[PDB]
Nucleic acid binder design. Structure first.
Ligand SMILES: NCCSC[C@H]1O[C@@H](n2cnc3c(N)ncnc32)[C@H](O)[C@@H]1O
Length: 393
DNA sequence: GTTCGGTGTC
DNA sequence: GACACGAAC
């Protein structure tokens, strides 16, 4: 799947290898990265491409092509430079996930990768594999989704990279015309330590990196675009997660099998609410977006907290904070559900106002840009709340 | 329990 | 661009 030439050129500009060095393109198909590196830096390297699909492998005679699953491949010797664009996707059942392998193959991947966590992703596994294949002081330059900067599934991967060498992350954003993904380039070197975060600007002449921040003692913490303002706001109030237990809605299959739940409206039945029912500062209790209906009073059988009016915050409205007080205490199939901790005093209307405020939207957009199409728990629990809105006694 | 999206669908 | 679900663990 194609990489824009300006992305390739940018990545090649970050790449290096010594004379006679071993240069690898994993998932290479026709080897556009090998070709670009050779054109830019010359011929005195050992070029290798690894590709699983015989129909796809189409390298020039000056490169060695290997037909293999890169994730399970064991070469005789490590590499000086590894570059390219790995495949992206979750391994799982075809009805829901795009990568389809025998369970036994998924088992080999889990055995192979110390960073594998949750559903994980091929791109995480490619990154780990590549790092393991680098000689000491070797370099990797990959373009991958930005999701690993922030997501829990990638916590082990971030800790692994922090531990194994030094990391530079260059934000590109949505640079693939046909693909819905916000991208970064990672340049990793198997020596030293620390993280450098870079923005980019694109011009006619390609991408130009702009240094944003440096974290010389990075240990795999979530990566964010921090500013003087984000810092200033964070120290102005209690993290939201110190004021509230944060829970998630019961999931669709739990409602679908529950004997109280119906697929048609009826006397005494209310809609099972989704994200579409959640608006800034109010809840649309009437419209049904889930296809599911149930008695309001039986909602507590799915989660005890559905019995109690409480704060609800959106998960799938992009990088935004959208909140409302569920005054009626309805069943929800989506969103975060925040229950105040013992001793917490709240002004719900004011807090909802603050969460929905322009200041709050700019805060989260600065920090997290468009890495993921969600406000995640790790973002939400860090939102700052001053004494006007909430107070822990 | 709750996570994630070479997103899904308008 | 608007505006957002179940297999996975
Ligand atoms: N480098 C372009 C994006 S990734 C798409 C390419 O990766 C190949 N590919 C996918 N999974 C692979 C794997 N595990 N090992 C080697 N090649 C793989 C595909 O056949 C395809 O040519």
């Amino acid at each position: 799947v194609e990489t824009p030439p300006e992305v390739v050129d940018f990545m090649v500009s970050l790449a290096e290898a010594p004379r006679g060095g071993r240069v690898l393109e994993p998932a290479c198909a026709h080897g556009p990265f090998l070709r670009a590196f050779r054109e830019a830096h010359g011929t005195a390297y050992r070029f290798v491409g690894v590709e699983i699909d015989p129909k796809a492998l189409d390298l020039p005679p000056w490169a060695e092509g290997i037909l293999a699953d890169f994730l399970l491949w064991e070469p005789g010797e490590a590499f000086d430079l590894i570059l390219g664009n790995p495949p992206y996707g979750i391994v799982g059942e075809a009805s829901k996930y795009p990568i389809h392998v025998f369970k036994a193959v998924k088992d080999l991947y889990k055995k192979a990768f110390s960073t594998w966590k949750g559903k994980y992703n091929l791109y995480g596994a490619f990154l780990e594999k590549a790092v393991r294949l680098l000689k000491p002081g070797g370099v990797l330059v990959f373009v991958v989704p930005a999701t690993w900067l922030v997501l829990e599934d990638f916590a082990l991967l971030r800790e692994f990279l922090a531990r194994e060498g030094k990391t530079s992350v260059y934000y590109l954003g949505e640079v693939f015309p046909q693909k819905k993904v916000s991208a970064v380039v990672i340049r990793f070197q198997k020596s030293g330590k620390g993280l450098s975060l870079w923005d980019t600007q694109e011009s006619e002449s390609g991408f130009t990196p702009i240094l944003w921040a440096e974290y010389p003692h990075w240990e795999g913490e979530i990566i964010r675009f921090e500013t003087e303002e984000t810092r200033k706001l964070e120290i102005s109030g209690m993290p939201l997660g110190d004021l509230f237990h944060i829970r998630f809605a019961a999931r669709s299959p739990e409602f679908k099998k529950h004997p109280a739940v119906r697929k048609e409206p009826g006397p005494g039945l209310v809609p099972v609410l989704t994200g579409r029912n959640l608006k800034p500062g109010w809840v649309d209790y009437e419209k049904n977006h889930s296809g599911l209906w149930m008695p309001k009073e039986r909602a507590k059988e799915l989660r005890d907290f559905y019995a109690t009016p409480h704060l609800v915050v959106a998960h799938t409205k992009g990088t935004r904070v959208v909140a409302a007080w569920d005054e009626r205490a309805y069943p929800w199939r989506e969103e975060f559900h925040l229950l105040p901790k013992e001793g917490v005093r709240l002004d719900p209307s004011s807090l909802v106002q603050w969460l929905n405020s322009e200041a709050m939207q700019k805060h989260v957009r600065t920090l997290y840009r468009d890495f993921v199409p969600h406000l995640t728990l790790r973002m939400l629990e860090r939102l700052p709340v001053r004494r006007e809105y909430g107070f822990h006694t």
